[PDB]
């Protein structure tokens, strides 16, 4: 079970709701599962002060938050204000819609350089930055993945939220990929199929992750299709 | 091993809140099971199977158990619910002395025997009024002991502790007679010593941790 692993501390991906009453049930589940940290999605749906009061009550910490690229492009100052309203989360690029995906190696380089500029401004405001990949960043140009192109061009203020299932599915070894990102990994992300309860060669991946500097194993439960 | 699976007790729809939003929250929290409360079996089987969530318990009021039990059996089997749970007693239905709590346990034990012959199990969910004591014994122990082991406890540990009884120790008196632990979601993170409650619950044979939305 991924939740019973103890190489990396566990964090849960949590979808925020407008109703702070129903948000409390999600936090009570984490308390009983022994999970103390969350990565938030849609955090702006709820009032910051209401969410802060509930997190404090349940001793849960927001360790990162999904911020779409159009918000980083359109008003970064507002992103900074919104994220700091709840504390100190890593600002994480969650996904790229098809229309935002570069087409060639030079485009992926330019995109990483763009993100590196945001990472500098976020850093000046006291916020870190991460990038969460899926499958389209695994495309390769002359032997190098789009993901490595953009992270290398962005510089070490941008860390990887590495989705290792997509790394492996593309035919790259996840542990070796983590070696190339030594000191530039924020977390490992994985889908969790195990039912909630009280409390891919993971046996090599999680040690490689920890040696690279990963701080969190972020687990996600999905809606069925 | 040392984990209790978590189920959620469903709640009524207030404001705009839909039922499917309830199930979607549970999917995203990873909760695989629900305890239902008081819409047709056709409608709720369909939504539960589409969200891949099973019913593990259903709150059935005492007046239904007393009035039409064969109908209770039919309705529970229609949604695949395996456990009939008495959720509450209104003040007028609460026995007044030790003899009355014993007689009430015997009554419930008769329903548990009939439910068992129909292939269904039975549990009893307490609040605070069952924690009253007669010559050292709680009303809750009187009724469970008198009902026999076909009636199990859905033990509300907050009300046990609030009455001055250690919930871990109380679970020890109910070894093999505990269906679930019950708790609400509005409690601050550490009143209740979950470091002792959870192993006691597991040792006693609890099958579920059931979370109630205040
Ligand atoms: Mn992410
Ligand atoms: Mn490189
Ligand atoms: Mn209860």
Residue numbers in the entry:
A (entry chain A): 1 to 199, 213 to 238
B (entry chain B): 5 to 42, 46 to 197, 212 to 235
Which statements did the authors publish about this structure?
Here, we discover an O-glycoside β-eliminase (OGE) from Agrobacterium tumefaciens that converts the C3-oxidized O-β-d-glucoside of phloretin (a plant-derived flavonoid) into the aglycone and the 2-hydroxy-3-keto-glycal elimination product.
The X-ray structure of AtOGE was determined to 2.0 Å resolution using molecular replacement based on a RoseTTAFold52 calculated ab initio model of the enzyme. A 14-residue loop (Thr198−Gly211) between β-strand β7 and α-helix α7 as well as the C-terminal region (Leu236−Gln259) show low electron density and are only partially modeled. Despite the high similarity between the two chains in overall structure (root-mean-square deviation (RMSD): 0.221 Å), only one AtOGE subunit (β) adopts the metal on the position that is plausible for the substrate access. In the subunit β,it is coordinated by residues contributed from β-strands β5 (His132), β6 (Asp163), β7 (His189) as well as by a water molecule. Glu233 from β8 is weakly coordinating.
